Amino acid sequence: PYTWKFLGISKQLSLENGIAKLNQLLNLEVDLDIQTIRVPSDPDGGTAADEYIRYEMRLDISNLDEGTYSKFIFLGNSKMEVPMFLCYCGTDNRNEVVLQWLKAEYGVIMWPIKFEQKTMIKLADASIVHVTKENIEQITWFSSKLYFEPETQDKNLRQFSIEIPRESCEGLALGYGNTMHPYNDAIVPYIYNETGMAVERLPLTSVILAGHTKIMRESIVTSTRSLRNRVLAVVLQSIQF
Amino acid sequence: EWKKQRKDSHKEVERRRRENINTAINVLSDLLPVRESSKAAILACAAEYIQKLKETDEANIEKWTLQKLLSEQNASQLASANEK
Amino acid sequence: RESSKAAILACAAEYIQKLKETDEANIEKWTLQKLLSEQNASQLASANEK
Amino acid sequence: KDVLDVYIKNLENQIGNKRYFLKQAQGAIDEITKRSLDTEGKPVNSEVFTELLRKPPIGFSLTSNFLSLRAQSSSEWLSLMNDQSVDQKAMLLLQNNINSDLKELLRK
Amino acid sequence: SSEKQWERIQQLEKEHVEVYRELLITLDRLYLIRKHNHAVILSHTQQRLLEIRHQLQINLEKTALLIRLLEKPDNTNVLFTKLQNLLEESNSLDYELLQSLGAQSSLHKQLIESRAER
Amino acid sequence: LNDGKEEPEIRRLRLEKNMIKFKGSANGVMSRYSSLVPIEKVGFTLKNEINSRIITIKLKFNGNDIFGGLHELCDKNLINIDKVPGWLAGENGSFSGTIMNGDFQREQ
Amino acid sequence: RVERINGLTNLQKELVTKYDTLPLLNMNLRLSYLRDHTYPHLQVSVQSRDRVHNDGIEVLVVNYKFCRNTMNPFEIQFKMFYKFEDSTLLKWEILRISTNVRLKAKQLLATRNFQKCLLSLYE
Amino acid sequence: QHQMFDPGVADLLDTDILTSPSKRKRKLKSTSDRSELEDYIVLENVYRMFGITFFPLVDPIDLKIKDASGEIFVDREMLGIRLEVFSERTSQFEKPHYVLLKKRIKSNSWFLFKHTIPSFIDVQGIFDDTNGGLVISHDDAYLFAKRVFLQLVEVQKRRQIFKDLEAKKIIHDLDLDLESSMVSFFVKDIKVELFVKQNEIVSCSILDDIHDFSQNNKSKWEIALLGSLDDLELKLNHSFA
DNA sequence: TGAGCGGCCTCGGCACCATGTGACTTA
DNA sequence: TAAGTCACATGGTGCCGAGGCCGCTCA
């Protein structure tokens, strides 16, 4: 239950320099981690300019809950119109101090990120593909639940959900064929063919993967302590102009 | 942390176990004649269906023995009528 | 009897499917035997009709 | 309402006649285009266009549609222009205030 | 059901004026091509006069059976009342257009002088 | 899925098509989305057989009038009215059940 | 595309423009159903539907030929008086009965409600 | 003559549409076909005078294309029947009751899809009783239709007899339930309430008690009043005098 | 100005699935 | 020691009757 709030950044800011100023301001050492991930390793997802820069800023004091574990995750690519976004979990009041310092030090323009319906479908696609230490990608199947809150006159239809079990989801994926985006290619077309609902047009408020994560229109909350690389990448292509 | 990573791994193992239990329950409900919703209702209907299939098998065995007796009687009687 | 509940439910599903298959096989075999007996009875009944 | 229905029938009859005349005209012009292998357009003679210039319920339809959507477009033009104008008044009030502020800052 | 009749006759008259305008254009270009062989590359100064003769034919027809219906006031046909409704909504907003244009032009002059001062 | 200011006569016809699909009558049984009986909660469990695999979809609904709201969503081009099934359209209303082999059997 | 369909519309053209639950308007198909499926072996025939439009009353004469026994089928001929609006059967009379069913039909047709009479004759 | 077109362009323009409306009508799409459709409608009304008719029906969901050239074929064939009972008292046809049968996808047999018949007539039980469950041929469908049309005839005839009893002023104000089975009426002031089965009175109850009225004569009247409905009308008019 | 019905709405009690962790077993 | 099965205790979504204030609302 770690909600991730997403904010975009107008500039490619380099964090390996100047973080000592943040350490002096906050009177505590942060555990900045540098990684260079290549998310679209699939040939159909692109084979060039796939490298990202992943920063994991962490206000490390103690490890009991998110009151002392408000992580910060930054992702960046210099070959894009918008070059950087951040996402941070927890509810500590030092996080907005970190954001204010980031603004006042790098001169960046920061705005909250809202996901569209197709963006949420692509994020649900991204959050099942897991990278393994043997450098392979594994699709872990979760019993999804598309959850809608339509606005109709006289509040005729307040809300309606579409629950899809795990074995039915993998059966739909195997029926479509060998694909790496199951929801956008197999689940959503099956829903459209059966019930007539275009879920990329309907007001979709959340899709819930049971036991793993439940992404919303403005936040992503995950049972897992971190956020995988595919979700970060899909958020990064989401905010492009 | 090391212990936090162990807790996360055990959490994932328990989640996989629960998903396997739910998948097995859904498969058993798919094999059920009448469609149920709750887990307890699914298990009770599965027990009732297994007992019903056992009774159906025993009744079919008895029915086949009675049918064989009827066929033997009909054949012997028709042969006797032919001789007469 | 199994230990894990998943194996118990999987064996229950397999037992239900096996019971259905055995019932169908018994019905088919008894149908074939009854067809043979009915053919013999019908031919001897036609002889009795003549 | 019977007079409205028969006038609707009369106008759809006229519409169908005009659609027929369009269909025959476009068939003729397409046949002449097919029979003319010259892709490049010939320069139009002025004397031919002169002779064209000497030669030749519709208007009720014309004035009704014209006046109706003319009034509608004028009304919505008032709506958009008045919103833009009150935006201009607000922007000019703010701009005059900050103009006085910059003038005072220049003097100081 | 009268509002349905007015809506219906509205799209019928829209399609009527559309088909008549394009019919007139196709007829005149058909005359141009049939008098010539393939002369279809006529200049802007000639296409504009074609548009002018179209426009004067249109408003001449409008005035022509404007003569036919408004000469003797029957005050019973509903098309007559439709003409007065259309006219009274057409001529109502004429002054406010020029008033708003002049006011917003004075606003634009204020923008110009404020920009020069800044 | 591919697709603005469509003709007001054929727009009336597709509105009539949605009205016919969700209420049975062209003019309805008589705002205008209100059905004959408002339904609060329905839950449908659609099951299919895609290459020897039973694929279940559990659709649950909530509101003051389920099928009126679905009719409004169909009017806003969010749900395809040519692909909305019978049970979603209000057939066997206020009954929640499982759709197997295209036949709706209610729950108990 | 807006299409107008009537009683003589093609079946394929009707299935092109079918989005309602109303019965099919293909009247040849409707009469094929009515002749072959619900009432087979019945040669119905209508020969005079003249009207008295001053009274608004339609005079119909039909011949029912129950041809299930093709060697000696029995046929009847009715005469109905419609009301043509606010539909009331003011009067119906039996014009002609075949003589081989004339007694049983004479006992049956003495009672009113000719719908029962037609269904009873067919049955 | 209103020569609308120029003589230079009237040669290639077909002006004959305005003179001949038949040319326009044959360039869009008669009176003999209208005559044959007219006779077809009259013949369909003649067939519907029987009461039990079959009409063709297509469910719009079951419309699919074969994709060979675009032939729309119905997937699951439907069959709808209508039951028009003739109300002799009003000399009118009552509003039809429609029963719609759809083919099972896996067994090729009709099933009770929809019906507009009230719940005091067990149409599902009648349909399951017809041919021991499954029905295939049109004969079984007509048998089920006749079996339920007899119930419609029974309720309409019972209501007709009681309404005619009211119309002849033989009895005072009465109350009818939906199938006209549980009734109560006053002959002079005696509240005679009846439970009547199909065209035969099986139970009777004389309720109102007068000081001159006795109980053994009441029981004798209750036994005598049993029997057919026409017999009840005759004997009630006999005992009224 | 004053009583007054109706959508809202939150309290909270109940119902049920969902969930994370220690204890314990298996390899 | 990595992984698995287990009941267990808490988390949480949905639901609904009670009741309160609000929100005009109308005389």
From Swiss-Prot, chain A:
Alphabetical GO biological process terms: ascospore formation; attachment of spindle microtubules to kinetochore; cell division; establishment of meiotic sister chromatid cohesion; establishment of mitotic sister chromatid cohesion; maintenance of meiotic sister chromatid cohesion; meiotic sister chromatid segregation; protein localization to chromosome, centromeric region
CDD domains given in the database record: IML3 (cd22875)
GO cellular component, one term: nucleus
Keyword field: Cell cycle, Cell division, Centromere, Chromosome, Kinetochore, Meiosis, Mitosis, Nucleus
Subcellular location field: Nucleus; Chromosome, Centromere, Kinetochore
Keyword check for Magnesium: no
Keyword Phosphoprotein belongs to the record: no
Note: Present with 125 molecules/cell in log phase SD medium.
Role summary: Component of the kinetochore, a multiprotein complex that assembles on centromeric DNA and attaches chromosomes to spindle microtubules, mediating chromosome segregation and sister chromatid segregation during meiosis and mitosis. Component of the inner kinetochore constitutive centromere-associated network (CCAN), which serves as a structural platform for outer kinetochore assembly.
Family: Belongs to the CENP-L/IML3 family.
Protein name, per record: Inner kinetochore subunit IML3
Organism: Saccharomyces cerevisiae (strain ATCC 204508 / S288c)
Curated annotation (Swiss-Prot), chain C:
Tree of life domain: Eukaryota
Compartments, as annotated in UniProt: Nucleus; Mitochondrion; Chromosome, Centromere
Miscellaneous notes: Present with 6890 molecules/cell in log phase SD medium.
Role, per record: Required for chromosome stability and methionine prototrophy. It is involved in chromosomal segregation. Binds to a highly conserved DNA sequence (5'-RTCACRTG-3'), called CDEI, found in centromeres and in several promoters. DNA-binding activity is enhanced by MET28. Required as an auxiliary factor for transcriptional activation of sulfur metabolism together with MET4 and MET28.
Subunit relationships: Binds DNA as a dimer. Associates with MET4 to form a heteromeric complex which also includes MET28.
Stated name of the protein: Centromere-binding protein 1
Naturally occurring in which organism (per UniProt): Saccharomyces cerevisiae (strain ATCC 204508 / S288c)
Gene it is expressed from: CBF1
Curated annotation (Swiss-Prot), chain E:
Domain of life: Eukaryota
Keywords: Cell cycle, Cell division, Centromere, Chromosome, Coiled coil, Kinetochore, Meiosis, Mitosis, Nucleus
Coiled coil keyword on record: yes
GO biological process, one term: meiotic cell cycle
GO CC field: kinetochore; nucleus
Compartment(s) of residence: Nucleus; Chromosome, Centromere, Kinetochore
Keyword Coiled coil among record annotations: yes
Subunit-structure text: Component of the heterotrimeric kinetochore subcomplex CTF3, which consists of CTF3, MCM16 and MCM22. The CTF3 subcomplex is part of a larger constitutive centromere-associated network (CCAN) (also known as central kinetochore CTF19 complex in yeast), which is composed of at least AME1, CHL4, CNN1, CTF3, CTF19, IML3, MCM16, MCM21, MCM22, MHF1, MHF2, MIF2, NKP1, NKP2, OKP1 and WIP1. Interacts with CTF19.
Record's function text: Component of the kinetochore, a multiprotein complex that assembles on centromeric DNA and attaches chromosomes to spindle microtubules, mediating chromosome segregation and sister chromatid segregation during meiosis and mitosis. Component of the inner kinetochore constitutive centromere-associated network (CCAN), which serves as a structural platform for outer kinetochore assembly.
Family membership: Belongs to the CENP-H/MCM16 family.
Other known facts: Present with 279 molecules/cell in log phase SD medium.
Name of the molecule in the record: Inner kinetochore subunit MCM16
Residues of the full protein shown: 4 to 121 of 181
From Swiss-Prot, chain H:
Annotated signal sequence range: none
Gene Ontology cellular component annotations, sorted alphabetically: COMA complex; kinetochore
Keywords: Cell cycle, Cell division, Centromere, Chromosome, Coiled coil, Kinetochore, Meiosis, Mitosis, Nucleus, Phosphoprotein
Single GO BP term: protein localization to chromosome, centromeric region
Subunit structure: Component of the heterotetrameric kinetochore subcomplex COMA, which consists of AME1, CTF19, MCM21 and OKP1. The COMA subcomplex is part of a larger constitutive centromere-associated network (CCAN) (also known as central kinetochore CTF19 complex in yeast), which is composed of at least AME1, CHL4, CNN1, CTF3, CTF19, IML3, MCM16, MCM21, MCM22, MHF1, MHF2, MIF2, NKP1, NKP2, OKP1 and WIP1. COMA binds the centromeric nucleosome-binding protein MIF2, and to the outer kinetochore MIND subcomplex.
Family: Belongs to the CENP-O/MCM21 family.
Annotated protein name in UniProt: Inner kinetochore subunit MCM21
Organism listed in the record: Saccharomyces cerevisiae (strain ATCC 204508 / S288c) (Baker's yeast)
Gene designation: MCM21
Entire protein: shown range: 120 to 364 of 368
